[PDB]
Symmetry: D2
Subunit: 143 residues, 4 copies
Amino acid sequence: DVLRRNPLFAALDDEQSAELRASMSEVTLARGDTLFHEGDPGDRLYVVTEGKVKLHRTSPDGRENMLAVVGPSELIGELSLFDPGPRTATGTALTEVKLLALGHGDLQPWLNVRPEVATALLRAVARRLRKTNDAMLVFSDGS
Amino acid sequence: GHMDDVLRRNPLFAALDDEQSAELRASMSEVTLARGDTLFHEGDPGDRLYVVTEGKVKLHRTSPDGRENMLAVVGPSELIGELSLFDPGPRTATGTALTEVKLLALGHGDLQPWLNVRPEVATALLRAVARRLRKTNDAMLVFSDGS
Amino acid sequence: DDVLRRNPLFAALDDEQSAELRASMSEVTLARGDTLFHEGDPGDRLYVVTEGKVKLHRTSPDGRENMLAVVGPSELIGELSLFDPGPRTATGTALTEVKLLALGHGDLQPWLNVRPEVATALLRAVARRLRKTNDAMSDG
Amino acid sequence: MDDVLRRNPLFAALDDEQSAELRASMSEVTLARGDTLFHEGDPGDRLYVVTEGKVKLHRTSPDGRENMLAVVGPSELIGELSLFDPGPRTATGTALTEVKLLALGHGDLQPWLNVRPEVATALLRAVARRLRKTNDAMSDSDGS
């Protein structure tokens, strides 16, 4: 429910979302705690359940580049679930936070049983890709 | 190894192993067009990906003025309607055979049986799509400034 | 160094061009909580923040404000509205007391009429943004 | 629009006298079928408007794959942003027919703006709109 309040999982039914929740782990942050640092290995997504999380980078002059504030029911590290890679930002608790995490290693076991879910996940991610490279302009003019 | 190389010269199936490529190939259907045949019409329901194996397909779209604007010319080893395999929806272009064309097609409907036979494929397909969506959004403009 | 030249748009201006741009601008002071502009307001003005911080936010489909950026000293707001006026797509709010320098689209032609090297510099800067875009970036 | 110059978003704002001047200040270029206008990677500093004939733009892929990109006909622009920000040609241009073009180079820009100072804001609007609608399309940030 908190879990289906995002486009990735918004297509799941009660049974499927109940199973997803049981595949996930509970994560707690105190205010000011770091969830991860830019460049850390990332192989998991989070759904925020309560509190707020800040994502930033830092410019070569030393100034914070503030990228987002992620609140209840929003995703962190969505694409890490499918394609693990270095974190592109540092995540920092602004408040007492609760999240649910799903790791890349938990993906295959969840999907082995449920190929109905794999297709729903593929539809979700492909919907997003569709709009991106469509928007991603022309210059087919040899500028 | 070189068996299904034609199916791997693209950002979707590039990482498939030889066995997965064999399953992909067995799952596909052969299509052959004569010159001037239309593969599909813009606006048609679309739920298939194609890999052209010979000939050329011109993709085109109807102009605000009634003419067809050229969009692409697709030849051997290139894909048509890639994301429609995962997210069926109306065709945004007409594909017209410029020559004798042969293609291999995979439909949305063929995906589930393949994933059921080979569950690792779901993870591999999710990886491939996530990778590109990543490059588009991340490796790539800003102006979060209001204007 | 120069608060106006720490952005890709005006970076290539020399000392005297920056000074004359600055003399052509309007200073704006905001108290904490003041709104610089509302989403949907006519937008025809670029700002450079010179002190404090401005939060840019957009109304989310669920009705919460969604933060797009926080803009600090040396950073731009409304850059493209200087050249191509149109509705503001975000609300800007002062998180602190804020001072800015503003240049409006109405000021642009008076400034450029006698400064063709500046105009060419600005065109290069905008175009380069397009070039690097596509240097980083269908099926039917 | 009958004007071979004002059928594109870049120059579409201009009035009759400023287009005629612009035209007479551009250089005429002639290509025979099979001529190369430019090679992908070549330094570029000018835009062209095709006045007659057709130019194929194609770029080259991993295996050495000549990859078709556009066919540019009369009243259409080639290398638009090369005028403002000279850099490497993103494609090869090959004449499909005998072709005629008008060329405007980066070096012709400052003298033009000296004679016609108000043109600067019209070009800025046009390039900024290209950039804005992109940004408007985009702005589709979670640590990845």
